[PDB]
C-alpha cells in the first residue's frame, strides 16, 4: 500500500494563490501516478491534475488548466499542488491520490481508477 497525507489548505481571497503538499509513503516505488481530486459538499469528486512519479508527464482537468500546476519531488518523496488565479467554483475538499501503473511506453499519467487517498484538506475561496 501505499499511504499519503495533504498539507496546506485553508481560506483565500479569489485571484489568490495557495500551495498544498501531500507526503507519500517513503518506500513508495516509480510505478505509480499521483494525482489530486477534489469534492465540493453536493457534488461528486473530480479529477484536478496528476503527475507521472517516474516520467513527470502532467494531465490537468481542463477548468484548472493554466491557473494550477503540478509537480513532484521524489527525493522528498512529495507531490504539490500550486493553486494561482483561485476562484469561487474551487472551493472543495481536495484529496492527494496515487494508482499503481505497470512499465508502458506511455507516460501519460491517469485520471481515474486511483488506489490510494489522502485524508483530504479544505481550500475555500472567498469573494
Known amino acids: 500500500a501505499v499511504q499519503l497525507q495533504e498539507s496546506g489548505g485553508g481560506l483565500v481571497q479569489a485571484g489568490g494563490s495557495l500551495r498544498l503538499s501531500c507526503t507519500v509513503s517513503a518506500r513508495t516505488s516509480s510505478s505509480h501516478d499521483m494525482g489530486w481530486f477534489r469534492q465540493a459538499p453536493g457534488k461528486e469528486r473530480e479529477f484536478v491534475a496528476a503527475?507521472?512519479?517516474?516520467?513527470?508527464?502532467?494531465n490537468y482537468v481542463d477548468s484548472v488548466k493554466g491557473r494550477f500546476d503540478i509537480s513532484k519531488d521524489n527525493a522528498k518523496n512529495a507531490v504539490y499542488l500550486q493553486m494561482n488565479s483561485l476562484k469561487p467554483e474551487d472551493t472543495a475538499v481536495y484529496y492527494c491520490?496515487?494508482?499503481?501503473?505497470?512499465?508502458?511506453?506511455?507516460?501519460?499519467?491517469?485520471?481515474?481508477?486511483?488506489?490510494?487517498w489522502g485524508q483530504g484538506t479544505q481550500v475555500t475561496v472567498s469573494s
Open positions: 491520490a496515487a494508482k499503481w501503473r505497470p512499465l508502458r511506453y506511455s507516460d501519460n499519467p491517469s485520471n481515474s481508477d486511483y488506489n490510494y
Open positions: 503527475i507521472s512519479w517516474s516520467g513527470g508527464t502532467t
